[PDB]
């Protein structure tokens, strides 16, 4: 995951509803379309948790649904709160559809809006996740439990197969760019001059791609 930059609130039709109404099912189709328009604008076209593509370049449409960060039954005070809304894929073995059937302490969950996830996780070339060292016991507890509840670190198959395929498909660009950088440092130039330019070009070419964070992390390590 990445750090989601929440914008100024735009709930619109959500303001019309109140606590007395409750009845999440009573939301109209136009209200859902407006909410999806905002979510798409803020979130891009990728899932919040697994970063799998959720919308094609518009017959069949990818399954998607709205998720609440906190459970509705326990935290009904946030049923219509704007900060509790998220977009999730329809995969029946991970993300929202998997969070429901699990027992966990909410107070020990990572929220993409509050804290930057890059301080905990560190992906590798073959698609597995490695927890960074030097963290406190509380942080290690959160990092170790969020993957378990989200099923984002399976032994084999699942998300790991797709992450590996994406990385091996994007490996050619990384190899070429690092070759150009190595050639440019074998003649003579300022390190920050070349580094800013390569980083800018690579960042420009990786916008709106599936699993962009894994390729991101796989890029700095190879880079000198």
């Amino acid at each position: 995951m990445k750090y989601l930059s929440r914008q100024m609130p735009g709930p619109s039709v959500l303001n019309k509803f109140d606590y007395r109404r409750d009845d999440w099912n009573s939301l109209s189709s136009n209200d859902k379309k407006e909410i999806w328009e905002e979510i798409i604008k803020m979130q891009g076209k990728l899932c919040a948790y697994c970063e799998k593509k959720i919308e094609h370049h518009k017959k069949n449409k990818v399954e998607r649904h709205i998720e609440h960060f906190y459970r509705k039954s326990y935290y009904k005070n946030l049923t219509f709160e704007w900060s509790n809304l998220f977009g999730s894929c329809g995969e029946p073995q991970r993300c929202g559809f998997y969070k429901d059937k699990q027992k966990y302490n909410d107070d020990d969950l990572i929220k993409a809006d509050r804290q930057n996830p890059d301080v905990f996780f560190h992906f590798l070339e073959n698609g597995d996740v490695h927890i960074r060292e030097g963290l406190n016991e509380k942080e290690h507890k959160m990092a170790e439990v969020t993957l378990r509840v989200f099923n984002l670190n399976p032994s084999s198959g699942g998300v790991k197969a797709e992450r590996r395929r994406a990385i091996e498909l994007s490996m050619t660009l990384i190899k070429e760019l690092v070759g150009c950088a190595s050639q440019l440092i074998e003649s003579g130039c300022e390190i920050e001059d070349v580094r800013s330019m390569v980083f800018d070009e690579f960042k420009k070419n990786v916008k709106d791609r599936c699993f962009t964070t894994a390729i991101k992390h796989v890029f700095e390590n190879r880079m000198p």
Partner: peptide
């Protein structure tokens, strides 16, 4: 399609040459 991985890999070469 635009977002097919093969198509993106094909388009990558163009950016490599241009850069």
């Amino acid at each position: 399609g635009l977002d097919h991985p093969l198509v993106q890999e094909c388009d990558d070469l163009i950016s490599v040459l241009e850069f």
